[PDB]
Ligand binder design. Structure first.
Ligand SMILES: CCN(CC)c1nc2c(c(-c3ccncc3)c1-c1nnn[nH]1)CCCCC2
Length: 134
């Protein structure tokens, strides 16, 4: 057992707060905000050795990242940003920073009770998304 055992699984979105405001702050356009905001994605997290894979499956877009903690990688986000990302573990929380066009956003994934709670921050705007086991 190891680094991210309590994150591994299939997690389904059950609540979201302020995600439209988060997306506006990020610079996402109107049509993508409306269609992406409808989706109820599954977040599928797995680990093989040092490599963590996080897939997002949704009616909007399917995406996938695989990474090693602390090691920067290229990511294409579901809204089509080309970002440079680094994900670390800080006190048991996965902390994901995306950098692009001189901007930055931080996404934190934490296990709380039987949920995976995702906090998404862009400047002064926070969105909280809660996922449950599928
Ligand atoms: C903040 C990180 N993150 C939330 C965990 C997401 N960021 C984004 C998007 C989605 C998204 C993917 C698939 N379908 C609908 C939405 C998600 C997501 N991934 N998994 N669940 N929501 C695209 C909309 C624009 C902003 C970027």
């Amino acid at each position: 057992s190891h680094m991210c055992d309590a994150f591994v699984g299939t997690w389904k979105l059950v609540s979201s707060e302020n995600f439209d405001d988060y997306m506006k702050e990020v610079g996402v356009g109107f049509a993508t905000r409306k269609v992406a905001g409808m989706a109820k994605p599954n977040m599928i997290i797995s680990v093989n050795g040092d490599v963590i894979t996080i897939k997002s499956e949704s009616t909007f877009k399917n995406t996938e990242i695989s990474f090693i903690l602390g090691q920067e990688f290229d990511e294409v986000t579901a809204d089509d940003r080309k970002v440079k990302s680094t994900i670390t573990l800080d006190g048991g929380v996965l902390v994901h920073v995306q950098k692009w066009d001189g901007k930055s956003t931080t996404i934190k994934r934490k296990r709380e009770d039987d949920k995976l709670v995702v906090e998404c921050v862009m400047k002064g705007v926070t969105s909280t998304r809660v996922y449950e086991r599928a």
